[PDB]
Amino acid sequence: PLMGTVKDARTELDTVFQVLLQTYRQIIQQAPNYLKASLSDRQDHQPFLS
Amino acid sequence: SQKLAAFLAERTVTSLSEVLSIWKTEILTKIQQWYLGIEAYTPLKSVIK
Amino acid sequence: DDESNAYLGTGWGFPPTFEKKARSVRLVSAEDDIRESLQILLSTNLGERVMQPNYGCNLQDLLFESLSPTVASNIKELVRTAILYYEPRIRLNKLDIQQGIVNEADAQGLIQIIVDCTIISTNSRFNFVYPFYLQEGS
Amino acid sequence: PEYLSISKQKPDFPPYLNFQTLRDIGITHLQALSGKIWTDYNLHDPGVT
Hints:
part of a larger assembly, 4 chains, A: mainly alpha, protein transport
């Protein structure tokens, strides 16, 4: 985009950023729903942490 | 947003490289580290991938 | 899982050791878990545990004395009582106490006590090892 | 002197302030979390201390 109209230079960068940020946000949003199961599903945690 | 405005002010190679380094170091590296830091007994492991 | 000697239990070692490459704390088992137990019991005085005023053994109350028969009998009574109350997993055989012999001047100042024990092949109703004690009782 | 004789409930404190209840809850949670590796719960164990 260093050889074209400053709009074309804008659209390309936004187009990549949008997809990256969509996937990022999906993961961040879904994470909180697994915390308690990550604990209650085992009986062999390290003692110094439990 | 800051980096993109600074680039659109003056279009040279260094501004573009900074815009790209933002993506490389703030999103993708962290997704990789999140993936490697989780075990398979949780469903998240299969979601991310 | 049911291994051998599981009824004797596993626990933390003494003193606590932390490994950093292996992100864990050291754990002992079987006969090592018993030996270390003894090292704790005979090195704690009676009032040092916060809500447990009866746990410990007052040996340092017998320092600065010559080893007469009346001192040896007192040492034996203290040690036997402590082990009877707080070590259900072993059987005590005999206590050997000697003073003297190295320099024959440094040797005069030290007392040596030997503890001989064996390990009982059955469980005990006073052993808090999980999950047997929930059914074996008290 | 406001208090001339005392009891287990005179001065009164909320029922969660009881050493034995806190201790029992702690032990139950420890067995639920790590009861498959750490099995020794006698008084010589540093964890109980």
